[PDB]
Write a protein that binds this ligand. Sequence first.
Ligand SMILES: C[C@@H](CN1CCC2(CC1)OC(=O)NC[C@H]2c1cccc(F)c1)NC(=O)c1ccc(F)cc1
Length: 576
Amino acid sequence: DHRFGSYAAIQENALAKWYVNAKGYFEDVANAMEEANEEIFITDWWLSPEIFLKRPVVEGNRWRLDCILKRKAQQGVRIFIMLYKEVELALGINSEYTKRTLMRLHPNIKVMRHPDHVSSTVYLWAHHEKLVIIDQSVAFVGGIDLAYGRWDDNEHRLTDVGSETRFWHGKDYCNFVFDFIDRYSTPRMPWHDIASAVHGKAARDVARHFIQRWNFTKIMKSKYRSLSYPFLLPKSQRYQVPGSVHANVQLLRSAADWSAGIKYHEESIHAAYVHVIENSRHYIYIENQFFISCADDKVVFNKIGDAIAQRILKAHRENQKYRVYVVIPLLPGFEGGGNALQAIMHFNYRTMCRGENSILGQLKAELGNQWINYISFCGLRTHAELEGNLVTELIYVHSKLLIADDNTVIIGSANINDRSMLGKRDSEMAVIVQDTETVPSVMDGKEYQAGRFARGLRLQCFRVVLGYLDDPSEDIQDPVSDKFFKEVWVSTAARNATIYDKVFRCLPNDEVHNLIQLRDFINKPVLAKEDPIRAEEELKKIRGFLVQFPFYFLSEESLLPSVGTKEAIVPMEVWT
Ligand SMILES: C[C@@H](CN1CCC2(CC1)OC(=O)NC[C@H]2c1cccc(F)c1)NC(=O)c1ccc(F)cc1
């Protein structure tokens, strides 16, 4: 009975702050935790206790996650951590270890894991929300877990062979695309993510979600054994993070009975995505880990992909100038010859370009090849010089971000898929921030009064991917202009994609349509190794990380014959 059907009201004039990449996010969460007085609420899909939140490594282990919690728990602070119980076959995650590891620090640290391992019921879905709440007054929401490989800055380095500084220590140096990886022979996979912070009553809204799940999980755990944990209570009607701005903030979530014990499932994140897309007047910026939409009422059901295509058709009808920006990883983040990778690539391409129900399918059916003037799909990629050999790796965009009209922003942990959006599936949490303070800006060449929160986030987002960071940043002020869209965004994305394909002969390529074509393409000479001087000079023309998304990678490959068996028992709705 709130806006979007959310459990949390619209906290008008609240303190909020956006984060691009984890470096600033981990730093503010560390400074906020150190100044805690009563409580610290943590919930993570994956948690790694021995990571440093302040880098370069400053004062020993002072800012290591387990030591930060240990230090505050010894001052009388009650810390509550809620972890996701991984599948038994998930070898990489060991929640039982971190559960004992965290609780062996101090008795003021109590951890609970859901789903229940002892329950006779079978759980398909996970707890993917990432929120840290301090004293129910400061709360952090986004798609960044307190886990290995999340910390990164805006350069997205591929190398870390210093002793000059070593940023990713030990297992924090990882590569989750394509045996402990060799730091001196193989580059790491950079982490591009988005998070945010809120204060005041909006942070109490984030806390109530934590309290509901904590008390709910305790009862469900009690069906099998008694717990020596306490019940938590919401605080009733002091600290501020530097750099926040005043704006309208509302909390959103994806919760059901199995996850939060709610009577009727909630998909406020999903409804807000559709509403912000439908009521956008100028542009939409999308930055998501997965692009699985365009509902067919059989396997896919969320309405985001249909909303994007139908919104462009209205712009084509009313002669409006509209720009959409979709940024997704070049490949899904899984260890082709895989089961989750082939399924997720398929349903991503199904949403993007393959099919009559796809976005471009709905577009081409009425405007033909002139969809290029409205929507653009891109990925991230970078290069580096390692051990004397030129190497490249894609940048995994794990952010779950939506921006519209330089006024509305949605930051959270929910991907664009049925798993995150339906609400009854994976448990997610997001925040929508509508701007009230205006700043002079440009849009469609005219004078535009844009908000400080949203335009500031778009500007920072544009600078990172386009290579205008610590630079004049003169062309990127107007995001809708015909000069910026065609000559800057699509031009930079197209140029970089061809340079990497010519220099590195990397994958994914829109020139490889079959798995048999894949084996011949990579056993071909590479330009980066046979002519390094020419490659290094050619690589200097790259600006930023933006590359165009290949539409025809493994186009002639079908999903069912590769993944299907004679008698299958795994529903396909798990990968959508
Ligand atoms: C790089 C990241 C990619 N994962 C992608 C998949 C998931 C989780 C992150 O993605 C999502 O968003 N939620 C839950 C997951 C999911 C699963 C199936 C279908 C989905 F749609 C989503 N891997 C890890 O962190 C990691 C790697 C190695 C490890 F040893 C331990 C952890």
